């Protein structure tokens, strides 16, 4: 990538300029150390002048004349060397300022762009999107960031020790203070921003259920944090508790529940360079409340460690993605809508768990399609026709062009609070019910194209009207949540177009969809013309004989 080629090129130039100032600070220390030896030679002349002055002025003229000439020329050398020493100091501080300003630009490319890109990619992965990918390139860049910032911090601290050994008043003191303020900002932003969650806890979290999380410190190895790995503490915080924690109005260490097995020491893995805390056996013992399915929480991960020096301790805190705590698993369906809306429509740099009330229809389409393919585990997602059917259902409109629904808005209540115009359910309750019946039993049938699904009673009437007798299609029931209805054509004296009574998961548990279809002889061709046995025969149950009937070896 061109962006990735630029980041690596900038690290190579930051590596060079850190060595340029390293070689200059060694020269500066040598110039100062040599200057100090010559200043003591200046003191030796005065000691020799007083030792000669006590004696008579006979042969004293010869010795005290050459000494005067020596003293005068040494004092001129010292006066020019002091200017050189000040010049080198200003030039070193100028180079340090130049490398730290380039460093700030590189730190902002990786921490405010590339890391945000990854965190967002991980947030959508909670909704069924593409995997966020490994933290390997981000760790190899943060290690280089820690390597360069620490080298420059050590160089400026050696430079200050030279200044305290031989102080020269001037602009250097303000430059050194300005450079010191810059490295503490770069060190805090790097440290506080690289304590991240690699593996998020389940966003629909049930009480008394084991769960896992993984927290990584990207600058672990390169800042000697792994010398004595810190203890990380998982604590469940509410939405209001997270607003105050981030707006510094935390006051006391607040919490809204108990997490069993919440203390974990970080583990350094050699031949990877990763410092991570794997919480594998966490469990939510209790939860504090004040609907349940709309109530958001977060897993707060706190740690405290000293970087390099003993007197440089950071208190890191990272918030997990919003978590909805359910108590009976029946609430899993309504909680999923809160998580889906949050993951999909969260704005960057937001106040804890602030989502938009209204969203545009194509935005909701992207989220629904993403979740759908992930639940039914199929590459066959929602086609342009499937999306039009959902818009027709949601907005109560008869338009068959997706472009017409582009500028329409869907509020959160229109999605999962208000029931559909003439129904006892919400749009999400219907869509999620379709995903629930497809995922529970019909994952292969959906992938095979056997279930048309997103077609209404009148649309299916007009698809089959002029087809041969026995043509049928599987459709989603409008009256029964999570129901599949067969629509078939068969010329008869009363009606020619029919709709069979819907089946739900309970029915499918007693007899599979294929077994049910195989019994009905008036179902001959699956729409538009594929013979029934070609589509479903692989799924028919072979009648196995029993041992109680008297069969020693398995028989069909």
């Amino acid at each position: 990538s061109q962006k990735h080629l630029q980041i690596n090129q900038t690290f190579e130039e930051l590596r060079l300029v850190t060595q340029d100032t390293e070689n200059e600070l060694k020269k500066l220390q040598q110039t100062q150390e040599y200057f100090i030896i010559q200043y003591q030679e200046s003191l030796r002349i005065q000691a020799q002048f007083a030792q000669l002055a006590q004696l008579s002025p006979q042969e004293r003229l010869s010795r005290e004349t050459a000494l005067q000439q020596k003293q005068v020329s040494l004092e001129a050398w010292l006066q020019r060397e002091a200017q050189t020493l000040q010049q080198y100091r200003v030039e070193l501080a100028e180079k340090h300022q130049k490398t730290l300003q380039l460093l700030r630009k590189q730190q902002t490319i990786i921490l405010d762009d590339e890391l945000i890109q990854w965190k967002r990619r991980q947030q959508l992965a909670g909704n069924g999107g593409p995997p966020e990918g490994s933290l390997d390139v981000l760790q190899s860049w943060c290690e280089k960031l820690a390597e360069i910032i620490w080298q420059n911090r050590q160089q400026i601290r050696r430079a200050e020790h030279l200044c305290q050994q031989l102080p020269i008043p001037g602009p250097v003191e303000e430059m050194l203070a300005e450079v010191n303020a810059t490295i503490t900002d770069i060190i805090s932003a790097l440290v506080t921003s690289t304590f991240i969650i690699e593996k998020q806890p389940p966003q629909v979290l049930k009480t008394q259920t084991k769960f896992a999380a993984t927290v990584r410190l990207l600058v672990g190895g390169k800042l000697n944090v792994h010398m004595n790995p810190p203890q990380v503490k998982a604590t469940i915080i509410s939405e209001q508790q997270a607003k105050s924690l981030l707006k510094n109005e935390n006051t006391r260490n607040e919490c809204s529940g108990e997490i069993l097995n919440n203390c974990c020491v970080m583990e350094y893995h050699q031949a990877t360079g990763t410092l991570s805390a794997h919480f594998r056996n966490m469990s939510l013992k209790r939860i504090k409340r004040a609907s349940v399915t709309e109530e958001k929480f977060t897993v707060l991960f706190e740690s405290q460690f000293s970087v390099g020096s003993n007197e440089l301790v950071f208190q890191v805190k990272t918030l997990s993605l919003p978590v909805v705590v359910i108590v009976h698993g029946s609430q899993d369906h309504n909680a999923t809508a809160t998580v889906l809306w949050d993951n999909a429509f969260a704005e960057p740099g937001r106040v804890p768990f602030a989502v938009p009330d209204k969203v545009l229809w194509p935005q909701l389409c992207e989220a629904l399609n993403m979740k759908f393919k992930a639940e039914v585990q199929s590459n066959r997602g929602l086609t342009k026709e499937n999306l039009v059917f959902l818009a027709q259902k949601l907005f109560n409109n008869s338009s068959s062009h997706l472009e017409d629904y582009s500028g329409l808005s869907v509020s959160w209540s229109q999605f999962n609070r208000e029931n559909l115009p003439g129904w006892n359910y919400t749009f999400w309750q219907w869509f999620d019910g379709v995903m629930e019946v497809l995922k529970k039993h019909h994952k292969p049938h959906w992938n095979d194209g056997a279930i048309l699904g997103f077609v209404n009673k009148q649309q299916a009437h007009d698809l089959l009207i002029n087809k041969p007798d026995g043509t049928f299609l599987l459709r989603f029931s409008d009256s029964e949540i999570g129901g599949i209805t067969i629509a078939w054509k068969f010329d008869s004296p009363e009606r020619n177009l029919w709709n069979l009574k819907p089946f739900t998961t309970r029915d499918f548990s007693i007899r599979s969809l294929a077994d049910r279809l195989g019994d009905l002889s008036y179902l001959i061709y699956v729409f538009p013309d594929r013979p029934k046995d070609e589509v479903f025969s692989k799924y028919y149950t072979p009648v196995l004989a029993k041992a109680v009937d008297g069969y020693v070896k398995p028989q069909i």
Side-chain angles (χ1 to χ4, degrees), residues 1 4 7-22 24-50 53 57 59-60 62 64-67 69-97 99-104 106-223 225-230 232-246 248 250 253-269 271-287 290-308 312-383 385-397 399-423 425-493 495-505 507-552 554-556:
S1 175
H4 289 222
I7 290 164
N8 291 67
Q9 252 154 342
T10 302
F11 273 137
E12 167 56 44
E13 89 185 284
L14 272 168
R15 195 192 54 80
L16 293 182
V17 304
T18 303
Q19 196 62 41
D20 182 25
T21 65
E22 177 58 77
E24 302 226 346
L25 176 63
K26 281 242 221 53
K27 169 177 194 167
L28 176 62
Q29 182 213 353
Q30 183 58 47
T31 299
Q32 176 167 328
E33 269 175 8
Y34 186 65
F35 173 85
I36 287 169
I37 290 171
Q38 302 288 276
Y39 194 86
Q40 174 60 26
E41 275 280 1
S42 176
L43 259 303
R44 287 188 65 177
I45 304 302
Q46 311 311 316
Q48 285 156 37
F49 263 144
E59 239 277 325
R60 180 177 144 198
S62 295
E64 279 195 331
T65 212
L67 212 59
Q69 178 58 55
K70 172 175 185 190
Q71 185 211 277
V72 162
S73 77
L74 184 61
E75 279 154 354
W77 181 90
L78 291 156
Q79 193 69 261
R80 279 179 125 105
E81 203 74 12
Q83 192 277 308
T84 284
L85 217 41
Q86 188 183 40
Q87 197 187 325
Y88 283 0
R89 286 183 182 172
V90 180
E91 278 166 353
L92 187 64
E94 288 209 53
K95 291 195 180 194
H96 279 152
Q97 252 152 49
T99 90
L100 289 175
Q101 270 43 82
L102 175 61
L103 184 61
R104 262 212 204 269
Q106 183 84 315
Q107 173 136 318
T108 311
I109 282 168
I110 299 170
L111 265 45
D112 290 32
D113 300 341
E114 289 307 300
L115 185 62
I116 298 300
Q117 229 178 96
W118 187 88
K119 280 194 161 215
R120 172 61 178 165
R121 207 181 301 122
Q122 188 215 44
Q123 187 176 32
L124 291 176
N127 270 13
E132 65 262 23
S134 188
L135 279 170
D136 283 24
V137 294
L138 283 180
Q139 204 171 243
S140 74
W141 291 339
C142 296
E143 279 167 340
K144 289 175 155 50
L145 276 185
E147 178 176 349
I148 289 157
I149 187 56
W150 201 262
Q151 271 193 262
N152 279 92
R153 177 224 156 80
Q154 287 174 140
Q155 284 177 21
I156 76 101
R157 289 186 56 104
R158 271 160 61 199
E160 281 163 340
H161 196 291
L162 295 176
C163 274
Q164 75 190 57
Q165 289 193 34
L166 172 53
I168 299 173
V172 175
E173 307 287 359
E174 184 63 69
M175 302 185 70
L176 270 175
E178 192 239 271
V179 154
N180 238 301
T182 306
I183 70 189
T184 72
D185 273 32
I186 297 169
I187 218 93
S188 291
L190 179 62
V191 163
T192 57
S193 306
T194 53
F195 183 66
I196 68 173
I197 299 164
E198 181 183 16
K199 182 200 191 155
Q200 300 276 339
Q203 295 191 249
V204 175
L205 189 63
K206 204 187 154 306
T207 176
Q208 322 286 315
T209 301
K210 205 183 69 178
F211 72 103
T214 311
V215 185
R216 235 206 240 197
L217 174 66
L218 294 180
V219 297
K222 291 297 189 71
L223 286 181
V225 189
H226 65 318
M227 265 303 286
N228 69 321
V232 188
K233 185 194 193 205
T235 163
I236 185 158
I237 262 73
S238 80
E239 187 182 351
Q240 253 304 327
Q241 285 167 11
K243 289 185 194 296
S244 74
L245 185 131
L246 295 188
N248 221 3
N250 171 64
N253 258 333
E254 59 223 338
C255 99
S256 43
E258 237 212 287
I259 299 176
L260 253 55
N261 293 322
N262 65 322
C263 250
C264 178
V265 180
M266 308 195 83
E267 166 189 19
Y268 178 91
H269 314 74
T272 18
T274 174
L275 185 68
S276 61
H278 282 84
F279 296 80
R280 1 192 80 105
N281 301 295
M282 287 192 290
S283 185
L284 198 49
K285 188 186 187 179
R286 78 175 58 86
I287 191 74
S291 179
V292 170
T293 59
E294 298 197 30
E295 187 172 23
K296 291 173 200 154
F297 293 90
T298 185
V299 189
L300 172 63
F301 289 99
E302 318 171 72
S303 195
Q304 176 180 334
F305 55 85
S306 280
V307 172
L312 189 54
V313 46
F314 297 88
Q315 293 206 140
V316 290
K317 297 193 197 319
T318 196
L319 292 179
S320 89
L321 293 173
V323 156
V324 182
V325 184
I326 67 174
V327 192
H328 259 272
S330 28
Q331 305 135 244
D332 202 288
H333 311 279
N334 264 326
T336 299
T338 305
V339 163
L340 178 112
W341 191 280
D342 188 284
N343 284 359
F345 311 124
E347 289 302 320
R350 83 202 204 268
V351 286
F353 320 151
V355 297
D357 198 307
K358 268 161 186 299
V359 87
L360 254 41
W361 171 248
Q363 298 183 253
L364 182 53
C365 278
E366 290 169 27
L368 293 177
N369 189 39
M370 200 184 295
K371 185 69 175 181
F372 193 80
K373 300 204 197 234
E375 288 279 299
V376 316
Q377 286 154 216
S378 186
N379 277 337
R380 181 186 312 278
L382 306 177
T383 70
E385 303 215 48
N386 298 153
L387 292 184
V388 161
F389 172 84
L390 291 176
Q392 278 169 1
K393 180 163 247 311
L394 178 62
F395 300 100
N396 194 22
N397 193 14
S399 180
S400 67
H401 295 90
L402 201 61
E403 315 92 52
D404 298 336
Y405 300 90
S406 295
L408 305 183
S409 75
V410 183
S411 71
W412 165 260
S413 44
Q414 286 174 251
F415 179 71
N416 202 34
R417 274 171 153 180
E418 77 111 17
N419 290 3
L420 277 179
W423 300 108
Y425 57 80
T426 71
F427 177 85
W428 172 254
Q429 278 171 18
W430 190 88
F431 182 75
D432 177 71
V434 159
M435 301 196 299
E436 216 70 25
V437 64
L438 286 176
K439 150 196 64 174
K440 276 167 182 176
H441 337 249
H442 315 316
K443 277 202 224 77
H445 314 70
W446 173 268
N447 204 68
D448 292 0
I451 304 167
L452 201 74
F454 309 92
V455 54
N456 56 61
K457 238 179 182 197
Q458 185 68 21
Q459 274 187 240
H461 178 288
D462 299 326
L463 286 173
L464 305 161
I465 33 172
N466 305 291
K467 278 289 178 200
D469 285 329
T471 312
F472 73 100
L473 54 96
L474 304 172
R475 194 179 78 84
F476 302 131
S477 174
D478 269 8
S479 68
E480 201 57 76
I481 292 295
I484 288 162
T485 300
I486 299 160
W488 86 97
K489 188 252 184 179
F490 222 122
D491 291 331
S492 112
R495 53 197 291 201
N496 300 332
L497 278 309
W498 317 75
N499 299 113
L500 210 80
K501 190 179 167 172
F503 301 111
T504 76
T505 50
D507 306 280
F508 294 134
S509 295
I510 298 155
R511 278 280 268 181
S512 50
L513 173 65
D515 271 332
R516 286 184 176 273
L517 289 168
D519 296 343
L520 315 180
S521 48
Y522 48 92
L523 302 179
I524 303 158
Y525 314 109
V526 349
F527 188 81
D529 48 6
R530 317 136 75 178
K532 197 175 70 192
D533 310 272
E534 301 202 356
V535 186
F536 299 97
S537 70
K538 111 185 67 184
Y539 308 103
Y540 296 155
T541 304
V543 53
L544 174 72
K546 309 220 291 169
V548 48
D549 299 52
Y551 293 86
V552 289
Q555 188 195 115
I556 308 300

